[PDB]
């Protein structure tokens, strides 16, 4: 076998070892492995897969396949990669092209030794994302490849959105399933998933104390709720930037400190706007929005000196990094840590004393400079990612007619039933034993015994 | 002279105005309301029906209604739940209101019917809110021609929108509603952390028990089961939780909590063979929180740890049987609103005996039965979704709706979340918070208007 | 058939002898020391005159006392902290008890002076209780005589401790003390615990206010200090800590406290310009700790918030400098132990004023104050230790030593260890909690016995 | 040409060079010592043997030392402890140190003879660093003529403490020791938060395992178990707690944790049957935190929940039975300082067989074996404190003193409060905190000085 590329194959058996452990912490997407194995529901399914090659990945990857299905694999980060989960997967006949410490170059080069097969194009059928990268090149640049494509299931907030605009602008060729607002998703992996690999990602890259250290957060939707659980738990002080007075609302209520980073929240673009204060007393700043330019060139001017700069939102552009490369000198500490010596562009002394320490140049920490979630976390993400791939598949999108292929080219949630089956067996996974309701109770509430229990507007 | 009210003693008027005077400071987004819509008057000729906890935060949003113009008919919709000092304050201002701490279910009907009735004939209203349902069943069942000149219905609670979608479902419901509670500044704010304040609170007021280091069961992880077991958990109890919601469960694993059912593999074969009895042997305090019935059962209250402590905070009291402990064992009241029930029979007790629980409240929602309820500043939030409600669906004028037009408005709805933001700004900057703008470029890249709505409807915060 | 006492209500007898039952299981050290000493009344012929908060918890330390054979005669040592049923039990069940709660400071020092005499003149009183040392000093300065016949002082606080040690160094003490502060149960239980459990309570019970989300200002991080800003902090509060010593400050610092001073550069120059206004025009709740005087200045309360909670839960009321507000500015009472400060003046005040402060139990023990104290099961600690140090002083007999004898038992110390871990094991099971027996080879590993005690006298625990 | 080392690869000396730059921004108390001594050079003439982790902290303490004018030889006083980069960086600065990760036992006391013998012969030492007494017991045990020229011994943690005290028991301690772990910003910070800081820390880069919602078994509540139940509980773990001290347990219950013993009872009867197996079958997660031998013993090891993580975070590794699991067990290393232990048998295993355990650091150390040990900021308490003790015992001049006057000076002992404070005071500083100063009227009041010491010796902080 030859059709893959990782940093370093003998890392195979480290990686099976850790395969092995993993599928013991995911058992929600192993029951799933082993109610579908026998009647394989994927038997004919090619996957085109984008996203973090990690050991919760190849376990994902291993199930898709145990349903019977082919896939060709690319992490959709330059970082993220776990080389020893790649080599395992490479190990095994399965095409992965993925490794950690990627260049753009290599990254794209990635993507596309997925979409070809000999240097033509794979007859994919079927598509998993994370963040849109692999989704968007495929509308842009093999537009032909979606006639053959049943559907894309999207992992996280911004590769939904970014399918909802094509949507909206009548650009999506397939339909497409957000598996990002599963509640089994959304408020496990986004919130509980960063509190458990924000502290990690800076730990590994600093061994920096948090406790008592002055913390800013940018955001407070999923992300930015369990990245300030993540620090406050620490024992950070932690103060939570917000635009939406809902998310600051809760933020108060959780025990934070609201604050903007611009005089009376305005930014002008100017300097004077810098609530320059504030800045000067922060410890560490994470952006976790989806935004952009949320840590602009003048907030990291006013930083106080050797704050730790990171981001946990999906792309690099958080944070003004194009600015510090410009003006600012970089010393690598070691892979995916830098320290920003503010002194000027040309040369820095060794010993400065006026620079930021960036994590993983910008790019996702958790996934950059630790592990990214654990895999009882991913668990609940994967499992709907197996079963978005299911639903899909058997709806058999591309072979519609074309009257059919316009009555379900939409971007769908999965059912509230799926997303509580998840739930139940991670609950298993804990120990925990869920109540069953007496018939007299389900009617009294005007729900089944079995479920679903909430009504689609209920929150969580 | 003023006559037109019945409340415990008059004279805690003054002292419940100074409580009210205070309670202003506390909810900024209510009083911005009472500042931005004094001059519009856009309540005048609103004639609402209210029944809902007579507390000083009730006191507040009952006098921003009138202030914005309307005139109400006010009782509390809990035997318990009144401040005496909010009920006097506000009889003080010559404002209808029949309510007491401590009313009997006789008096609590008694009471919601002096709404109703002005001098012995239907009142003019035109508007409702309400709390967990009762004055809308009562209109609804006893007063049909009251609600053909009833704008629309504000109702307060998880409860109440349940009966009111169970109303519309079968074509029942005879005037439009707005679901308050599904406001985030509403169930994301009072549900949770208005009960992370006051469960602890009234337990402490009812029991002086310590807390730390003792075991806690709660029944229950919505978003009263999630603040409840904050509650007990800062405190330092030892808290699992139940649930029959595997989602739920889920964020109550994740939170740290330990999740249990109360019957062996969480199903009830109808016999105390079921019952967890090593479990519940082991439990300090039970707290429901679940708005459904009989989720702390008879053969639940049998195998509790002796001297446990029993509560709700769900609306009604059927979440325990205490019907069962009525008819079984023997009740000591310790003080208002805390009993000791013997189980060592119906008749009598030992002074000294050991076997007993202790019930606060009656099994009434204890954080307004033992305590004094949410916090101002957190009702704060409710009650501006409230005023905001009242005004929306007062302007409608359903009541003048012709047949045709009335069918195309009956519905269950929550304000639009423009509101909810604009409330929970001025919340936000009660406390100091500074909310950022996004930019032009920022707003564009998102896909959203500067000034909001931030969120897709479907975003679950 | 009784009429030595003097209480605020005589009839709210059976309701404080039915949260006496709670209590009673509520404290399994102290009742385990009433069933162990119980047929050997190793208090026989002991007088002890007893000045600590007559609350609940105080009643099942005195009827432990009584039962072990001792007679007393009790006060309240703080105007504000007696629970008027507690009181009204001890007095129903014929032991002399002189409290109630709201007593004026000549009130308080008859209530001492009640005690102190039976029928008009001075009782043979033998031993002391004390919490603060305001009967200590009385009897020293006032009454020097009964010290010839008193066998020791066994004193409960912080401050009154430090008071002991003065007098100790200054050669006036006259009868030996035991140190019960400073056992591990006691200080580092009752004064953290206890204040986290009753800190939040008290200002809940008087306010009512929001806690989460709101800027608190603890001065002070000693064992007070420590449960206080816990206290707080789990209610969500963004605490940020005061300290004199720098290491009690590295805790702060460590525990994720923000740690300010009230004066820039934490210098105090009685200057206006030394207030960090900024800061203090942030806090809405100031709360000293520190058992020192004058912590919080006229400065810093002209400089504070509108609308900041003020209270005090050091011993002595002195810590908030309220002479100055007494002189200065208008109080205005919500209810009782609750104050509004109108910093607009001081012959008057508009009922609608902003600019105003609210001081809680008028600067004295605000957990005493406005709600209960302590909890049962934490004063269980405390009071065992104060029955085991009245036991063991109690059988010195100081008082009847040659004067060569005196002079080598003359000072103040600490209960044993081992005393210290039999207390910590009772409060351990009454929890449940079941603590591991070393094995042989283990003790013999780390060098303790089996049975304890466990540390060596310098561990800190 | 230096060659006077031996590390993993000297090629890390740049990387452990600008981690090391960095770390001293991050300990300004063991930096502030740099500046304020560097040119009094109090260390000159001293020559230090070392034996403490090789980690980036213990290198700017190590050139800390060098700075004020010392000479050292290092090594690391456990197989798994050393960073290879600090390694490096210590060699590439020309000083002689012999520690890399992942030494046997054999290499571990090859690399102490190494500090010891300079060129085959004893170096001219004076000043000892240890950390767990293992460099101390082989100077009195094989080079006893050596201590004759030493002046004392500085010892980092709590089991080379008692060691030195056992020795100075029996007489046969040789030379005077500070006990560096008893400082508060030793003890309190270090030993404490350190563990809270970095257990979770080891844990997750060994495992990757999810924390929240699992079940942890924390054995022993001193100051490591207290950070050690925090580091889990912050995660979101069901935390049950081991202690044989009744005192420690009763924090134990008011911290909010369940007090267990993996005994029925608490007593080990050595048989089988004591074991609660019920309890270990529910256990994720047992951490040893006692110094104490066999404290997780091979019937727990059997009994535990299938893919337990066993780990220990005491001094050394026989908390935990590892040789029972040596002698029985199949051991399948995932990754270095992380095995499966596979229960199923001593000669080979089932590569997906689920009866197994997974072991840490093979039992050593887990926050140093499997993660970087404590952050500097918390290490810069302990170190500043071991120059301070190294400042203090080399100028003593103990083996320069005649007998008589040895004899007064044989003593373990902990440095003075006022250099506790002072350490504790720039650690404040370097967290932007600002200690108050006493007016002269407050520190009267109190009795204190306004420089401090702010406590008694006996305060427990
Ligand atoms: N690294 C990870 O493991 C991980 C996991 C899940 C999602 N993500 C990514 O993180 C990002 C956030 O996802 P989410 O689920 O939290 O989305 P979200 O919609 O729940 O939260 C984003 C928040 O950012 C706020 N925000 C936007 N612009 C802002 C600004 N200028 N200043 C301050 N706050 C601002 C919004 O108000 C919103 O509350 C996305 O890009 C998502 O793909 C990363
Ligand atoms: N007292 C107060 O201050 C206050 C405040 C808000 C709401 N409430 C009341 O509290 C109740 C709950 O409100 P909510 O907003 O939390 O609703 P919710 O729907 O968010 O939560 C109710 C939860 O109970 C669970 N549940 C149902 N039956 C159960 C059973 N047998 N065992 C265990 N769990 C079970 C459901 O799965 C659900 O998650 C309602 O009656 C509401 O009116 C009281
Ligand atoms: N209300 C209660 O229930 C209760 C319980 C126990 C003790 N107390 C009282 O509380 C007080 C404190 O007791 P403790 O045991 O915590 O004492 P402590 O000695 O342990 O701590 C007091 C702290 O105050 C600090 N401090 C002193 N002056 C200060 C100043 N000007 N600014 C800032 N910090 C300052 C000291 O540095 C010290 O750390 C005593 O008066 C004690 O009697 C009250
Ligand atoms: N890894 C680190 O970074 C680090 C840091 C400091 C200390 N340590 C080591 O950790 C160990 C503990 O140090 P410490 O400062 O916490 O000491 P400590 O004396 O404060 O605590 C040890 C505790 O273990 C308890 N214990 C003893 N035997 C027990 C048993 N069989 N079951 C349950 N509990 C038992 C004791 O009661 C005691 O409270 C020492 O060996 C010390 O050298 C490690
Ligand atoms: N202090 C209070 N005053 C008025 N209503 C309250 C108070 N506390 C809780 N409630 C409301 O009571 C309802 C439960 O009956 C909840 O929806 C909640 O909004
Ligand atoms: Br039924
Ligand atoms: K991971
Ligand atoms: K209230
Ligand atoms: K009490
Ligand atoms: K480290």
């Not at 140049?361 to 668990?379: F, K």
Request: with cysteine.
């Amino acid at each position: 076998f030859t059709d893959y590329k990782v940093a370093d194959i003998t890392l195979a058996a480290w990686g099976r070892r850790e395969l092995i452990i993993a599928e013991s912490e995911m058992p929600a997407l192993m029951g799933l492995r082993r109610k579908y194995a026998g009647q394989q529901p994927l038997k004919g399914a090619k996957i085109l897969g984008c996203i973090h090659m990690t050991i919760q990945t190849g376990v994902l990857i291993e199930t898709l396949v145990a349903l019977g299905a082919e896939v060709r694999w690319s992490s959709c980060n330059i970082f993220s990669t776990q080389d020893q989960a790649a080599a395992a997967i490479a190990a095994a006949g399965i095409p992965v092209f993925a490794w950690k410490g990627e260049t753009e170059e290599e990254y794209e080069w990635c993507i596309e030794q997925t979409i070809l097969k000999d240097g033509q194009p794979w007859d994919a059928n079927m598509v998993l994302d994370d963040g849109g990268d692999l989704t968007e090149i495929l509308h842009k640049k093999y537009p032909q490849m979606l006639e053959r494509i049943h559907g894309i299931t999207e992992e996280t907030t911004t590769g939904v959105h970014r399918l909802l605009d094509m949507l909206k602008n009548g650009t999506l060729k397939v339909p497409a399933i957000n598996v990002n607002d599963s509640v089994t998703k959304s408020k496990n992996d986004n919130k509980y998933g960063c509190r458990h690999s924000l502290n990690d990602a800076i730990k590994r890259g600093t061994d920096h104390l948090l406790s008592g250290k002055q913390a800013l957060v940018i955001g407070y939707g999923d992300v930015g709720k369990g990245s300030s659980q993540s620090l406050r738990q620490e024992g950070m002080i932690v103060k939570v930037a917000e635009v939406d007075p809902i998310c600051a609302m809760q933020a108060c209520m959780d025990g934070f400190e609201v604050v903007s980073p611009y005089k009376n929240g305005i930014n002008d673009g100017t300097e004077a706007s810098i609530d320059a204060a504030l800045l000067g007393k922060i410890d560490l700043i994470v952006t976790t929005t989806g935004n952009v330019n949320v840590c602009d060139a003048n907030m990291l001017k006013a930083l106080k000196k050797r704050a730790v700069v990171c981001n946990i939102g999906h792309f690099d552009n958080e944070i003004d990094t194009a600015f510090m490369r410009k003006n600012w000198a970089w010393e690598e500490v070691k892979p995916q840590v830098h320290k920003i010596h503010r002194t000027g562009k040309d040369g820095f002394d060794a010993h400065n004393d006026d620079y930021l320490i960036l994590l993983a140049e910008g790019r996702l920490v958790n996934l950059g400079n630790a592990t990214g979630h654990p895999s009882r976390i991913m668990d609940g993400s994967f499992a709907n990612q197996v079963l978005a791939q299911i639903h899909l598949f058997e709806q058999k999108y591309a072979d519609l007619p074309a009257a059919e292929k316009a009555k379900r080219l939409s971007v769908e949630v999965l059912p509230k039933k799926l997303d509580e089956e998840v739930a139940l067996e991670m609950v298993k996974g804990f120990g925990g034993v869920v109540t069953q309701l007496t018939p007299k109770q389900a009617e009294y509430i005007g729900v089944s015994v079995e479920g679903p229990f909430k009504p689609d507007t209920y929150r969580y």
